[PDB]
């Protein structure tokens, strides 16, 4: 019901870990096959939709 910074996501592939800032709306991150979504933490209850454009 708000806008702005809402949390974080962590991704891992192989021997790399990456942490990203999340805002309301779209967040778009290039990824390679096999990447794992290991954590997400939001600051307020939200609807969460995760998909991949291939």
């Amino acid at each position: 019901t708000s806008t702005g910074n809402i949390g974080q996501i962590t991704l891992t592939i192989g021997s790399t870990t990456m942490t990203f800032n999340l805002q309301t709306g779209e967040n778009k991150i290039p990824v390679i096959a096999g990447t794992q979504i290991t954590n997400l933490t939001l600051t307020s209850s939200s609807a969460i939709l995760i998909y991949e454009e291939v």
Partner: protein
């Protein structure tokens, strides 16, 4: 000892609850990791809720800015919130400080004030302890749109510390409200808290009673003619002493203050040898003089020397003569006006010691706010 990515352009304002700002912040000036949390705090009864970065358990996070910002004197403001249930300290940069501190209460919002002069590759640096939530970081130039530095009474010293900054031409008031607590049973009498300099002005309290506490305000002025623009404040007392002070800082441009103007009188009696008699000396006070009129009565042919001399003591200690009552007459003419001066003396000679002549000087002068450089 850690490593950080710094590719992004630095911004002059960040609201770290906004993704973009935070992404930039943490790819340019932030050192360490963060956890995003929901932070809330009270404003007039209402509870503000944001998501902002939080420094985690571990080593302290730092903000470091070596980027090529526009040159100038910056007031920094970083809004924080202490999520810990214990209080936490921070040590502001102030250009040269590494011992004075702020104290941030448990469970509370706090504004950290900091001063950064961007010249000669200076690099801003501050550490932030675990459990502090960073909400906003602001860099603004002061002395811009008639703004001033105005930090409230929150800075903690226990005897050492420095703050530096750059002032362009002008006359400035430096106002430092303070509180102290003397834990010691010594009772101090011409207590030098510290100095302001470029020229040096001591900040002195008349009396600090044993086992006492009190409050006051130093108020001092600097005339920055422009060739020496960097001012250094130093807390100089003790360290071991056991008199913790807490103070604020306010630096602001003023238009000129005639503090007073006075008619003053001085007799000198001559008995055969040279006397040099100090009239007023105002060096180190935060002011300077302007002489408007001078006269001497009681001159006779028995007086061989009678010269008023003046200098800016912060530029030369050798005075030069500013009127000669023998060579020129017993009183100054209408265009006589002596400016930029700190100290005045009469040097005279004559009489005998079988006959002493006594002359008397009168002098109108103004005392004007600002130490001369």
């Amino acid at each position: 000892g850690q490593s950080f990515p710094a590719n992004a352009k630095v911004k002059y304002y960040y609201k770290l609850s906004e993704k973009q700002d935070l992404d930039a912040f943490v790819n340019s000036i932030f050192v360490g990791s963060y956890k995003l949390k929901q932070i809330s705090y009270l404003l007039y009864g209402n509870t503000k809720i944001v998501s902002a970065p939080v420094v985690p358990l571990g080593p302290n996070a730092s903000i470091i800015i070596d980027d090529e910002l526009q040159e100038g004197l910056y007031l920094i403001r970083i809004k924080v919130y202490n999520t810990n249930s214990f209080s936490v300290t921070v040590t502001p940069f102030f250009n040269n400080n590494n011992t004075m501190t702020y104290s941030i209460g448990a469970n509370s919002e706090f504004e950290i004030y900091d001063i950064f002069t961007k010249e000669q590759g200076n690099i801003y640096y501050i550490q932030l302890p675990p459990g502090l939530a960073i909400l906003e970081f602001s860099l603004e130039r002061v002395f811009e749109k008639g703004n001033r530095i105005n930090i409230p009474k929150i800075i903690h010293t226990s005897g050492n510390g420095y703050i530096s900054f750059r002032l362009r031409k002008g006359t400035y008031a430096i106002k430092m409200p303070y509180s102290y607590n003397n834990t010691t049973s010594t009772t101090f009498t011409n207590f030098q808290f510290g100095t302001i300099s470029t020229a040096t002005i001591p900040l002195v309290i008349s009396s600090i009673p044993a086992n006492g506490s009190g409050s006051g305000t130093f108020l001092v002025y600097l005339k920055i003619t422009g060739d020496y623009e960097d001012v250094k404040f130093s807390v100089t007392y003790g360290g071991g002493l056991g008199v913790p002070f807490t103070f604020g800082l306010e630096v602001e441009e003023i238009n000129e203050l005639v503090e007073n103007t006075n008619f003053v009188t001085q007799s000198v009696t001559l008995s055969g040898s040279q006397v040099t008699q100090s009239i007023l000396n105002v060096q180190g006070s935060g002011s300077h003089l302007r002489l408007k009129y001078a006269s001497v009565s009681g001159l006779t042919t028995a007086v061989t020397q009678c010269q008023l001399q003046a200098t800016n003591l912060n530029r030369s200690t050798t005075y030069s003569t500013v009127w000669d009552f023998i060579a020129g007459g017993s009183s100054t003419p209408p265009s006589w006006d002596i400016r930029e001066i700190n100290s005045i003396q009469l040097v005279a000679n004559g009489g005998s010691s079988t006959s002493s002549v006594t002359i008397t000087l009168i002098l109108v002068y103004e005392q004007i706010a600002g130490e001369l450089s």
